[PDB]
């Protein structure tokens, strides 16, 4: 009766499973500098996990399941508080290249179309299918 | 180079390429201190 | 060494102390055949029916003027 959609399961497990599936598919092309960059100015170090690209793409897909968005919107989503040293902290947007590349990879995998009104990206006819299948696989 | 009051004479060496002219004509005078006066501190204010 | 005496607060005389932090209270001993009543100085908020635990009960506070 339950666990027929992404909203019906824990989002931590959901994004974990989405990243696992995306890695297994092997159709995602991780960018060359993946192990060379920070995910935003507010961050101090590069990601600890070498596979951070797959996790970021999984998070992007999971959020697109909830609401259509664009690169700037996802920059706000993944941005955070930046410590300016001796000055007080302030909000800072994340980088943009990583989100753009992940979204383009999802489009390649056919998990993301463009909004019919041409105002961002929406989870695809196949993206919804795949994500709901992952959710019902989570089940329990 | 005018420093606001006078023209400081300066020869342009090859070492000054890539620098502003004003950086070689100081506009102020280095400070040498003078035994603080009455208003300094709070004991001498009276 | 005076037995721990538990006394209920029958009524509150009024505030006292340099800054009015203490309260004068009339207290009635709980386990007491003669039902002993005295006046004590208390710290902190106290109301009627509160049970105080006097370490020694021979002392009596001076009545408020």
């Amino acid at each position: 009766t339950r666990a027929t959609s992404i909203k019906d399961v824990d989002q931590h497990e959901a994004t974990k499973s989405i990243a696992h599936f995306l890695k297994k598919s092997g159709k995602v092309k991780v960018p060359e500098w993946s192990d060379l960059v920070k995910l935003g100015v507010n961050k101090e170090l590069a990601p600890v996990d070498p596979d951070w690209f797959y996790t970021r793409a999984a998070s992007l897909a999971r959020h697109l399941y909830f609401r259509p968005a664009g690169i700037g919107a996802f920059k706000k989503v993944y941005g955070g508080n930046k410590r300016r040293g001796v000055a007080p902290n302030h909000f800072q947007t994340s980088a943009g290249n990583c989100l753009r590349k992940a979204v383009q990879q999802l489009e390649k995998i056919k998990w993301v179309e463009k909004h019919p009104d041409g105002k961002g990206r929406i989870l695809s006819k196949q993206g919804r299918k795949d994500l709901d299948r992952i959710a019902t696989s989570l089940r329990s | 180079i005018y420093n606001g009051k006078v023209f400081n004479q300066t020869e342009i060496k090859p070492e000054m390429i890539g620098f502003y002219l004003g950086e070689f004509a100081i506009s102020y005078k280095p400070v040498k201190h003078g035994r603080p006066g009455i208003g300094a501190t709070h004991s001498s204010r009276f | 060494m005076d037995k721990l005496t538990l006394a209920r607060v029958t009524k509150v005389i009024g505030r006292t102390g340099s800054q009015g932090q203490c309260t004068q209270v009339r207290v009635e001993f709980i386990n007491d055949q003669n039902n002993r009543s005295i006046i004590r100085n208390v710290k902190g908020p106290v109301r009627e029916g509160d049970i105080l635990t006097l370490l020694e009960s021979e002392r009596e506070a001076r009545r408020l003027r």
Binding site: L36 | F24, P30, P36, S43, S44 | -
Partner: protein, 97 residues
Amino acid sequence: NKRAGELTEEDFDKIVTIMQNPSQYKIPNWFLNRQKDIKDGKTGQLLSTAVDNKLREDLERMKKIRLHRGLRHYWGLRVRGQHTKTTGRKGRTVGVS
């Protein structure tokens, strides 16, 4: 995720080689602390005593050419335009009379 004490010597030689020649191992020029050197024009990373040596050389160059920044450096004052009226005091209080 491993303590440096568990690491063998050849690993350390590998790492130092990468550090001395970052450009060979696809480390971009924007990742280095000495890019487009004012004298040589090379882009490299200054390691160990090279950092102190280059700092000394830069200060000497600026002072010798009598740049405003060099003069302030050699006088011992702040060089980035900070106010020096109240902060930066590391001396002894001086009385009046």
